[model samples]
Target: HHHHSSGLVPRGSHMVGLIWAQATSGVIGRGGDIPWRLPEDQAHFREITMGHTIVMGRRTWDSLPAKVRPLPGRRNVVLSRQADFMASGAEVVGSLEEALTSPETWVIGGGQVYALALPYATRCEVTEVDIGLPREAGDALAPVLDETWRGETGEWRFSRSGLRYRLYSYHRS
Candidate 1:
């Protein structure tokens, strides 16, 4: 099912978006396992912070450890339906429309938010790991890219585990 957001931006313009630290193993509740080194991911994240605001689902926020809860260095926007939900370092909103009014936006997700934002995103910066996980995973799975978004590869790196990954950037026409 497709979801609509009141936060839709002009169709032809672009917004910086990201899908990071996602696991291919299909396991849930393992956010702490994201192993990209701070030196590697931090600089990239810092660049993201300097450029675009970030939007994430509650699950993604919850998955983060407390110290990282209110992601520092950028405008952190969280999407949750709970009216009383609150995070000290971030703005908690009910939907994407509410979050999109920010000067620039990035959609960080744990599956659900990615699906919701796919239709509206102008570009996506995805970190695709070179491994596949068990196939019987639950509902919180990332979607395969639709035909509209084209890929742009940035710097590629290998984790200490010997797994190679690339920063795949996508732009929608």
Candidate 2:
């Protein structure tokens, strides 16, 4: 009996998309919420995520405005590690696999979940932000771009607040 190396399973053609903005040190959040704002980035997100499944962590779901919860016009899937966890106006899933079942998924969120879903990603759309604040140096980390990926950075974009930012796309090689 031949053992150990049978290719018994075939993975589907799953597309993993990640979208988010991070600080200079790759902090996506501090105080359990975002530390900066980029209007254009939000608009870009709306444009891309409108017709697809966007999966975020439970905390990310809570981080939304009460009035804007379940962001209209798309499927909202939230991943929770807590048992029987629930989210209002969002599909609550307990595992990455469950939240990722959608054919095309955008993992948008608060750090930990990103790390958990990093390996399966086909590409990522990231915004790099530099916010010099007293308490904004955070622990929430963004997934470090590895050598297996290529990052194409766009020119610096300025906000009215004079905040500088750049958009970058990363594709797995």
Candidate 3:
């Protein structure tokens, strides 16, 4: 695997960008929870992250259902400024810099975290759904891709629930 260097993320570490999307507005969530319930996307997330370390903002951690607090089988690291912040099954770090200690890390999101972490990512994995949501209606959004990255779409498929979506991969060029 290729590694990238950053002052925040340690040298020789890879930060993989991951997101689920809607075609029109890049809407990621609403009211702290993902608006769409795509089982395929959830499975893709689990498959990619099963044994890897995932770094996410406090709000994203909070958005998870109580039963799956720590998202089993992976190391859960949460970024929060609150000194007293604690999750029963996860580690809480004060800054994004602190969260980057792991060699295998995925920058999972809330919009603010995604914005802060995007610059250090080596590659990104995106799930593009067919639905279009109004930008104003979404409480969270994915980071906008700039010229530094190149993206390509994989095969288009339909979920058991009939949601049309495709997987996309973006690498920093």
RMSD of each: 7.8, 9.8, 5.9
Tens-place lDDT per residue, model 3, 22-122, is: 55478888887887888888888888788888888999999988898899998999988898997878999998888877877887787888888877787
lDDT ranking from best to worst? 2, 3, 1
Best by lDDT: 2
Please provide, for model 2 over 49-125, each residue's C-alpha lDDT reduced to its tens digit, 9 standing for 90 to 100. 89889999888888887787898888999887777776767788888988889998989887888998999987788
**Candidate order by TM-score, highest to lowest?**
3, 2, 1
Q: How does residue 90 of candidate 3 score in lDDT?
A: 92
Q: How does candidate 1 score on lDDT?
A: 0.65
Which pairs clash in model 3? Answer: none
* TM-scores of the candidates in the order shown: 0.75, 0.85, 0.86
Cα lDDT, model 2, residue 41: 79
Off by over 4 Å in 1: 1-16, 22-39, 154-156
What pairs collide in candidate 1?
Answer: 7-97
Error of 1 at 126 (Å): 1.1
lDDT of 1 by residue, 47-156 (tens): 65664678888888887768877777777888899989977888899877887776567787767787777777776666655566554534366667777877555555
